[PDB]
Design a protein around this nucleic acid. Structure first.
Ligand SMILES: [Mg+2]
Ligand SMILES: [Mg+2]
Ligand SMILES: [Mg+2]
Ligand SMILES: [Mg+2]
Ligand SMILES: [Mg+2]
Ligand SMILES: [Mg+2]
Ligand SMILES: [Mg+2]
Ligand SMILES: [Mg+2]
Lengths: 96, 63, 99, 92
RNA sequence: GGGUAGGUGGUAAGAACCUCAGAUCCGGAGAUUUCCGAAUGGAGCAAUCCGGUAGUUGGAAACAGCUAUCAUUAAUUGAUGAAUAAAUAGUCAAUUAAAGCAAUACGUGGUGAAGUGAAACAUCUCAGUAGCCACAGGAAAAGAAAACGAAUGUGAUUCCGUGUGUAGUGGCGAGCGAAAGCGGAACAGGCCAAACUUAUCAUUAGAUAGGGGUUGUAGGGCUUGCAAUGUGGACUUGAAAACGAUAGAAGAAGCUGUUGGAAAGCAGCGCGCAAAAGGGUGAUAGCCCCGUAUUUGAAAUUGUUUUCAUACCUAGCGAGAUCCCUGAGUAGCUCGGAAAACGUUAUUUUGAGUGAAUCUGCCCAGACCAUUGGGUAAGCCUAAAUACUAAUUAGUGACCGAUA
RNA sequence: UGAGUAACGCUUGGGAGUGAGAAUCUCCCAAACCGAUUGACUAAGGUUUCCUGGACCAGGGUCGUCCUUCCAGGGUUAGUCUGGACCUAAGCUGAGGCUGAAAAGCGUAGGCGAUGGACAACAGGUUAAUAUUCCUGUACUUACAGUUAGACUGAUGGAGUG
RNA sequence: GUUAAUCUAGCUGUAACCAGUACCGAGAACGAACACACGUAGUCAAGGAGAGGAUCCUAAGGUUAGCGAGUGAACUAUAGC
């Protein structure tokens, strides 16, 4: 399954941008891109302030139910007794 | 071909070693004869048969 | 979207479905020749549907063919026919009048 | 009768110039493997009007895109004009 | 079946759509699969032209749609059938089979040179090579001693090392080069003809189908007994088990600072390891991501091995008795050639001719004879060691890095 | 380097116009050569080279607004024309067959093979591009069915003609 | 064939298949590596004088030979004497 799914909150780890929380819009898995809304605006001088894809390695999930809104890794293991595969943090126990 | 049709004994290839032992290819052709023969249903037929096989047939009384 | 026509009467009415689908497929392509075909996406879907129905037919010992077991055009053909009649009558009349 | 012999109608200025006559010579491009009898039978089955005459021609493939580092070949197609009785017309 | 949330093959944006009632995608199984092409209804200048027959629909009919079928050869079967009475050839019909391609690689067989060296050249050599042709196989070929050979000897074939550059062969020139013996890889030997006998053939069988027998310390058949019900297959069916092959899933560990456009660099303080292979991430990341070690995963197809029952085949030891059988245009021999390391020589092979013996037999131990000893030809088959890699998967390199 | 050297591979003048750019493009007037041909129809051959609109990187032995160059769109219509569905010549192919180490070679019945034979359409008009094809006018030929009148029809073979 | 076919003739009606059809056809679209003075079947083939398709000028029709402008020396070629 995919670590990043279109529609969730996410931040950037490295680059000129830091801590850029935003909603992801599109994923190009064959070339490992992600379109995060509201960040990395390449000023196209058409013959605009659209955004440009950021690599999956830079992106990292962002928890909201934690008191300390930190950034951590993920596990696909946690399978509900009455449901299918899910996401869960490693140094925590909070689904997605 | 120049081979009989009871067996398939065809020509043979060797060398024409003349005096002083020079080499030249030459063909040995089996001796074929058209002597007739009678099958055991009637159907007496004429076929090209080698003389050695003619002797074999003669001594076996196949005519 | 395939098992839903296995349940359906997969022996007779499917050829009527196929001939219909052929009808609007041909009409869609003819409109595509001109403009005014605002939904080109229909062609691929209808071709795919033909493919599915033909597969459902060919799994069975059947063929979509041989299962089949004009208002004013006739008037225009008529007028053409008596026009030809009048021309032939005039021609024969003149030819015999020459003699 | 499969109606896989009526590929497309073509609309060119020559076609229109023939349309503003009175016979209304409709034209189509057809399956190259088909024949005039098949074309007229298909036309009868698809519209209901028995044609008056059918004429055909085929455009041989030619070099297309000229010199463009990837030249290709054009399409071999057969055109079948379909005359009608003088007093009739239909859409397409 | 797996797997999810994006997708509509690349130069590619857009538009218009599909998609979380499970898409796209990946694996297994399928169907569709125009024309040419071995091309095979007939032609033809390949991808075109012209058909016949039997159905079916429309038409009043030619005809037109929709299907099916029609090459040749060989074998089998049936019908028909002349010169001529029968009978044969021939004719027609029905069933089965290849008929082609390539893996520029291996195998066997048929045929088969020159250029070159000999310091020229014909004998030789190159070389039974190259090429052409036929036949295939997953390997093929060979193969169960009428053997090697010198012995109180081994005991199918095949491949490797040695023997060895030896014995030998050679215008005794250039050159060529074993067979034993030994050490190893592998290991399985079976089955017909023949007498004898059963049945059936105008039983003139001289033929067909059964049982019996398959050979060298000769065996088998013939008469009469004894002992056995087994071990084994180069072996049939299923059932069961196991390990796989073709998609996958889980899969640890890090922050700060500085230089800097960017840190993953460097420094400080930590952590994981059955995972310090790799790739990517804005500069060189064990802890950012995909993966990796490790553990697991098959609805369907398929491979291998094991077990069970199960066909088929396979079974030892005596006594009598001039009884019979043991592969004939065959072995030898003559004249020409050839293979064997031999350039014609015992051994093997054959184009022409000639042509035996039958266990007190026949052949052999590099002319030939005798003694001694060895082995039983003129019938068939057989896996393993062996040769190769166009193809699939994984991987490797003191291999190349855009004149390589 | 040879070197900005030989060469640029059968001919003009002018007016007007376009355009940024004019000897070379368009129009106009002359002029000069061809005129048993540089004139018109076509076979084979080429395969879009044809027409319209646009462009002047590259090609044009110079220039270019222009080209047989490049881009975009368009254009060939047959019962009677040329060929096949008809016929054979030289020749090819060839069931059986004969012959040959193998491949193959020869050849019979058959089957192909026009450069020839038989076979029904003419004048005019029309578009930028087609025209015995499209259109108008006039005809002709062959099949097929029905109907009417008459008549006995006659081949896969024979004969004449061809 | 005869309890009829088949043919001839007329009338009514139906049908007539496949491939080529553009353009050039040559001192610029073909064969000559070329916008190369070369080669390429057939057909149409006007007037004057002329036997004539010979020759000269022309008719129908077509072209501006895809580098020019100057000077008019040597020298070269082709003409004229
Ligand atoms: Mg100059
Ligand atoms: Mg100079
Ligand atoms: Mg000079
Ligand atoms: Mg000069
Ligand atoms: Mg010329
Ligand atoms: Mg000519
Ligand atoms: Mg004249
Ligand atoms: Mg002249």
């Amino acid at each position: 399954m995919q670590r990043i799914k279109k529609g969730d909150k996410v931040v950037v780890i490295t680059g000129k941008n830091k801590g850029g929380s935003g909603i992801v819009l599109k994923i190009m898995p064959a070339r490992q891109q992600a379109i995060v809304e509201g960040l990395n605006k390449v000023t196209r001088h058409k013959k605009v302030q659209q955004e440009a894809p950021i690599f999956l390695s830079k992106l990292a999930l962002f928890d909201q139910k934690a008191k300390q809104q930190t950034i951590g890794k993920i596990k696909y293991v946690m399978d509900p007794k009455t449901n299918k595969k899910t996401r869960v943090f490693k140094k925590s126990n909070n689904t997605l | 071909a120049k081979k009989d049709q009871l067996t398939l004994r065809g020509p043979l290839y060797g060398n024409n070693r003349s005096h002083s032992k020079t080499i030249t290819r030459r063909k040995w052709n089996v001796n074929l004869q058209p002597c007739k023969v009678k099958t055991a249903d009637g159907k007496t037929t004429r076929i090209l048969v080698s003389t050695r096989t003619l002797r074999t047939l003669k001594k076996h009384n196949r005519l | 979207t395939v098992a839903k026509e296995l349940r359906q009467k997969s022996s007779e009415e499917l050829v009527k479905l196929v001939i219909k689908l052929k009808g609007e497929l041909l009409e869609y392509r003819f409109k595509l020749a001109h403009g005014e075909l605002d939904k080109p996406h229909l062609i691929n879907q209808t071709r795919r549907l033909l493919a599915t129905i033909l597969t459902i037919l060919t799994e069975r010992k059947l063929n979509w063919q041989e299962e089949q077991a004009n208002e004013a055009a006739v008037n225009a053909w008529k007028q053409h026919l008596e026009a030809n009649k009048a021309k032939l009558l005039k021609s024969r009349a003149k030819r015999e009048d020459a003699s | 009768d499969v109606t896989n012999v009526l590929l497309k109608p073509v609309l060119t200025e020559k076609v229109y110039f023939n349309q503003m006559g009175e016979t209304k010579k409709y034209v189509f491009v057809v399956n190259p493997k088909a024949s005039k009898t098949r074309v007229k039978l298909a036309f009868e089955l698809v519209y209901g009007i028995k044609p008056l005459k059918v004429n055909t021609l085929i455009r041989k493939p030619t070099t297309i895109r000229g010199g463009s580092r990837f030249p290709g070949l054009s399409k071999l197609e057969k055109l079948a004009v379909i005359t009608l009785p003088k007093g009739i017309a239909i859409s397409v």
